[PDB]
Design a protein around this ligand. Structure first.
Ligand SMILES: *[C@@H]1O[C@H](CO)[C@@H](O[C@@H]2O[C@H](CO)[C@@H](O)[C@H](O)[C@H]2NC(C)=O)[C@H](O)[C@H]1NC(C)=O
Ligand SMILES: *[C@@H]1O[C@H](CO)[C@@H](O)[C@H](O)[C@H]1NC(C)=O
Lengths: 21, 49
């Protein structure tokens, strides 16, 4: 629905913690 | 440039994006503008008519 949207990664600070855990 | 030409710098900004800031200013989340941009534009154009 959004006109002019673009693609990019959005960082999630929980993921690297669980990954390291 | 929205309100920025009043403050002095006249910073360009896409019109749909400054309208989305106007929405934040009235206490409506900016996603309401982009999700309904076609309707909002149609309403504005009709009101000017
Ligand atoms: C942004 O990424 C999405 C994928 O997440 C792209 O969507 C695909 O686009 C192709 C055509 O280029 C289609 O064949 C696929 O079916 C689409 N996939 C989905 C899940 O919709 C999209 O094109 C990308 N946008 C830009 C500007 O690169
Ligand atoms: C921006 O304008 C150009 C033409 O100057 C057009 O090709 C492009 O699709 C437009 N992009 C958006 C997001 O409207």
């Amino acid at each position: 629905v959004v006109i002019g949207i673009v693609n990019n990664t959005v960082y999630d600070p929980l993921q690297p913690e669980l990954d390291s855990f | 440039s929205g309100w920025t030409f009043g403050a002095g710098a006249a910073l360009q900004i896409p019109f749909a994006m400054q309208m989305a800031y106007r929405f934040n200013g009235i206490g409506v989340t900016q996603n309401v503008l982009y999700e309904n941009q076609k309707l909002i534009a149609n309403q504005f154009n009709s009101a000017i008519g």
